[model samples]
Target: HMAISHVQLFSVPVSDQEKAKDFYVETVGFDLLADQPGVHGRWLQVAPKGADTSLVLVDWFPTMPPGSLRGLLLRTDDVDADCARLQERGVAVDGPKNTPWGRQAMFSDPDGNVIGLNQPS
Candidate 1:
């Protein structure tokens, strides 16, 4: 049998780091670890309530435009709850879906970034 180890950073590139920070922290309700001061890109840490989870955010890609990095998957126990909350908050989302993979929903930040909600069946 094989065993898995610790997971570190899984990163994606974005054109605007500051904008990403705002959406992820303000809209997504993630605690701020570090935001870029003058020139550097932002770094944030968002964790789950329990167990082990990794932090995710958009990165600054010099060659890329303001809107590039899009699409992510989020696992939630209550997709309905999350969907309603985001909807009420005026966050743009694709609503809900039930897939052969699982029950899932799609949502985006103010930056037009697309993220998905997935629940195991």
Candidate 2:
């Protein structure tokens, strides 16, 4: 096996760091792990509570523009309840439809990065 254990972090491009931070922390309920200034720009990290992997909201990438990232999946204990919570927070969730693998829902952040919520069977 490889020496690498797991993915530590990944970047998610955004136009505004503050707006993206609020959406991920307040709206999506992710924990704010870090919010500090870096050489390129602000290093803002967020993730699901107690999750191993995390996302770094970046505005410095030239090619990876905002909303380019898609299919970022997050596992949840209850997809329906989570989707409802998103809707209540003024986020438009597309589906909590039943699939062969599980129940899933779709929604996008303010910058248009699509995120999927899934409750596996």
On lDDT, the candidate that comes out on top is 2
> TM-scores, in order shown?
0.71, 0.97
**Model 1 CA deviation exceeding 4 Å by range:** 1-4, 36-40, 49-53, 56-59, 63-65
> lDDT for every model?
0.64, 0.94
Q: After superposition, how far is residue 53 of candidate 2 from its true place, in Å?
A: 0.2
Candidate 1 lDDT tens digits, 70-113? 66687888888888888787776675888898888887555555
Clashes of each: 1, 0
Candidate 1's error at 96, in angstroms?
Answer: 0.7
- Write down the TM-score for model 2: 0.97
lDDT per residue for candidate 2 within 1-121, as digits (tens), equals 8799899999998988899999999999999999998889999999999999999999898999988899788999999999989999999999999999889999999899999999998
- Per-candidate Cα RMSD to the true structure, in Å, reads 3.5, 0.8
